[PDB]
Structure formats: structure tokens, C-alpha cells
């Protein structure tokens, strides 16, 4: 129970850091933000937590892309041997 209480404290701190990023309102509560670089441009992100801080908005703009690079895998050839 001692180690269990410490694991729940660690889980509570990680859950608090997760729900910092979580929007306070619901999902359909639509918030659109236009960020500009000092080179004048308009980039639109959709979120409520990303409205206030720049880093969550830039993490959204990084995460909104659907193209992923190839990561080659060794395919775990150790299991082929007995």
C-alpha cells in the first residue's frame, strides 16, 4: 500500500499535467485561433486550450498533419532463431 500510494500520487501528477491540456468546455464549443509569424501570414487552429498559450497551439499545428515518415524496423529476427 505504501508503493501503491506513491504510484497513485505519480498518476495524479501525470493526470493533472494531462488535464492542463484538456479543454474546460465540451468538444463542440468551437474556438478558432489565427496565429501570425512576424512574416505576415494567417494560420488557423481549432481549440479552446490552444487559444491562450502558444506552445499548445504549435503542438496542434504539428499534430494536425497526417503525413508520417517511414521508420524502418529490424522486424525482431531474434525470434526466428530457436
The footprint of another protein (CB under 8 A) covers: 32, 34, 37-46, 54-55, 58, 61-62, 64-69
Least gap, CB of 29 to another protein (angstroms): 13
Cβ distance to another protein smaller for residue 40 or 73: 40
Q: How far is the CB of 28 from another protein (least distance, A)?
A: 12
Cell digits of residue 38:
512576424
Q: Minimum distance from CB of 46 to another protein (Å)?
A: 6
Based on the number of CB atoms within 10 Å of its own CB, is 48 exposed (0-12), middle (13-18) or buried (19 or more)? Answer: middle
Give the contacts of 35 (CB within 8 A, at least 6 positions apart): 42, 43, 45, 54, 57, 58, 61
Amino acid at each position: 500500500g505504501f508503493e501503491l500510494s506513491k504510484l497513485l500520487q505519480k498518476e495524479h501528477q501525470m493526470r493533472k499535467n494531462v488535464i492542463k491540456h484538456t479543454s474546460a468546455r465540451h468538444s463542440r464549443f468551437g474556438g478558432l485561433l489565427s496565429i501570425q509569424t512576424p512574416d505576415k501570414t494567417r494560420l488557423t487552429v481549432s481549440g479552446s486550450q490552444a487559444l491562450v498559450d502558444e506552445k499548445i497551439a504549435l503542438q496542434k499545428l504539428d499534430d494536425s498533419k497526417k503525413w508520417n515518415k517511414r521508420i524502418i524496423k529490424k522486424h525482431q529476427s531474434v525470434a526466428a532463431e530457436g
